[PDB]
Assembly symmetry: C2
Homo-oligomer: 96 residues x 2
Amino acid sequence: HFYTLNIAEIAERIGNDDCAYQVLMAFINENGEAQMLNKTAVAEMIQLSKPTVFATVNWFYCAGYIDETRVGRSKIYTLSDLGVEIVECFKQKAME
Amino acid sequence: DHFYTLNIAEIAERIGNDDCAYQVLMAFINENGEAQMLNKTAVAEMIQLSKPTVFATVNWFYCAGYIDETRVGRSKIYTLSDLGVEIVECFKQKAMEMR
């Protein structure tokens, strides 16, 4: 069961969500490369209510934006191929 | 442009494991199994969960692309996007094959 979707419009929507945009963008180091993060570290990068930032990371998971990997004791998140593609819109939208 | 292919199965199970998400999704399917439309308030009312909680989900469901929003009179009303209908028609099937 696949579904093939115009990413550009979701990327628009997220891009209109103050809180969502920042949580996606965290996963991008200054070198323009994606990076792994746990929920705590993200919570720190962004000045916003730790609750809301945890809640945002959670749905991002759901939605399929960020992959989760079990590391020893804690859970660590990276962007999905989808997360990367959404960032790739933003990358190009800032460009032009 | 920017097209991308989701696995709907993978998104479904993820949603299936969130009590609030599942219910918010399913609220757009009526008694007769047809898809319907609601505003934020009507969703909140069907779900037996913190109105705040329901509102955050309806928000992010919108971001995710599961629902679209249509202006009417003096009321932003929500309806499943095609994606949202994908996600349901997937739950519907897992339940279908079950019985």
